[model samples]
Target: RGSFVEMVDNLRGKSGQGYYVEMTVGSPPQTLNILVDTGSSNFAVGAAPHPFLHRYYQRQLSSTYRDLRKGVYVPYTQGAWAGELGTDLVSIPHGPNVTVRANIAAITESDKFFINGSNWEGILGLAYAEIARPDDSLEPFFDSLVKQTHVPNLFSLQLCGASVGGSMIIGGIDHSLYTGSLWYTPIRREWYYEVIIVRVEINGQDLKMDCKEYNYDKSIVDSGTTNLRLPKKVFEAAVKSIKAASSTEKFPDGFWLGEQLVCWQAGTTPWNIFPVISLYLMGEVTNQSFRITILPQQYLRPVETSQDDCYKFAISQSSTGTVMGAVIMEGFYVVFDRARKRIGFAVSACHVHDEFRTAAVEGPFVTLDMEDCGYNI
Candidate 1:
């Protein structure tokens, strides 16, 4: 199958980080580095000028750009932005060359979304436009790009973590990018790639809670958020269990609270202190489930601190359900098969960086044929 592969950079800045790609988003084309975010639906860019961004989409220079003049607001977990809705020709270089007319948000003001010295100048919301702002009839950039081009209704992502380059293969999966057949999970909602998490096991120890608690309200594969944000209860349970297993009660509460980072000089990372975490999710059949395991290295993000090899705790508590963010995504090659309403996970060809390997997926582990997960919160 033909695919358009877009190279991405995982910028691990001390202030923040995310996967970014260069996209030409205007006539006579203006190339801007845009963040890949499945957590949102609005393709927003720095338009009215911002101190943080080095450059912005010069909407006035694009002959084909149209100012829809409608106000749009997008509020994220940590920040928000207000902008005007517009239409422009958005295309990816070295991609399919399918320059399609897509909805765009020319951001005028924002809260804490844009970081100073961040590589990305904007965001490419890869999720469906059902949750799109200002209007319900908006068409997401990817959705328009796929329909106007000669490709299937699917795309795949492989996030090579911590400065290792990543990529997003649009339209189809590149078999060579993955090791084997991908384990599939049915999408419970079209708005986001929502799925069912039957259980969570750390070091083969299952969190003793009802399966419904895992996805108390929603569990989505969001590539935007940098860390794994578990439901309140799940987060507490995981911390309690991990403390016992890792024997890390002496490490102060700030470390677990995400307020502090753990350091051990330089190059002496304690991977031994953490255990492999398995997220048992729904697969092809209701009677069975599969697992995508994440190693400790994926969760302990190596970040630059003042004169030390410091690592950040990559999981936290969330008011919403388990939002599998970049921390989890960096572990596998994810397939969003929009046509079939299912997502796939496979050990990525980028699974190993240097000498260390960090993720795997295996399954059809006989789960007691539970009914379809209908518990929506």
Candidate 2:
């Protein structure tokens, strides 16, 4: 369990043709085609090119596109691209149609930034961020047309367990998608919610550690990621607990490497055994405990050196992460309510199908494979 208290099903979709966001910069409609991605953050379009795409999207050219050359540079795991930060008046003609301007950025020649083998034109990050303070968000994408937006929007998926046209409601919570009343945890500060480690109880033995100092990024609750990341200290102790408790050398990393098992090792005095890292979230409205996967598959290689071994249990130092991916997200229904800045999850009895397991392509718009979530109590 990580800092992200609740989990939600992150929907993935083909990087469709880059979207041309038509909006007002000053007095007219300005258009820009931006990429959409559920995996990363910080949204922008290509304006680096001289003849920006869709510069002629408007017939009359009531709006003048001013390229803010040095104003915005958003970097990623890939090579950096140049773009600009400026304001625009956005108009959505279809779906829940409306017009509004926001702190939008644009880049040009984004076709070069496409992912390998991806036909996706661009990516639109529909998650929460401080990019433009309180107002710049996709929440408007949903709330403008609908009423009663759910925070960290809630929906269900059985993965390949669903059929085609799987339904997902963007503006509000579809009561039909859930089996029980929504329970909540209070939102906290820390760029997202800091991992509130309630206690680290390992196989009946409690270890001593306070994981409050670690900074956590909330955006990592993405279905696109493959694993949940923990702080180095907590991860090590967890592995140690499995080494101390389990008799068999099942895992070279000291913990039984299962989807739902916690790992820890024996401490110097043995009394200092590793503790099961736990999350204490939302004022105790609900609490969940999963078998901690201390040793991620990436770190299990037989590399020689005490330093290599020491680094094995530590989480990556990079920020903007803390992904609560399929590893911990299994056997649960995650609800995302972008408007409320909160996430909700309860134990779901449903299981994701082996195939079509990805959420964006398979769950939100296609079919939902849902079953009852067992009682939280």
Candidate with maximal TM-score: 1
lDDT of 2 by residue, 144-222 (tens): 2233322233323311111111123233443433334343333343132222333344444655554231223232444
lDDT of every model, 2 decimals: 0.80, 0.35
lDDT of 1 by residue, 1-377 (tens): 22343333222233237877778988788988888888888789999778889889888899999988789898888699988888998887744547888899998899998987677889988888788786558888888887788757887788877645677777777776788769999988888778888878988898867878888788999988888889899999998887788885357788888889878877666677677888998988857899998877777777765559887788899998889988888889999999999999998777543354457788888776344344644
Q: Clash totals for all models, in order?
A: 1, 51
> Worst ten-residue run, lDDT, model 1?
7-16
- TM-score of every candidate: 0.93, 0.49
Model 1, runs deviating above 4 Å = 1-16, 305-307, 352-357, 372-374
Q: Which ten residues in a row have the lowest lDDT in candidate 2?
A: 361-370
Alpha-carbon lDDT of model 2? 0.35
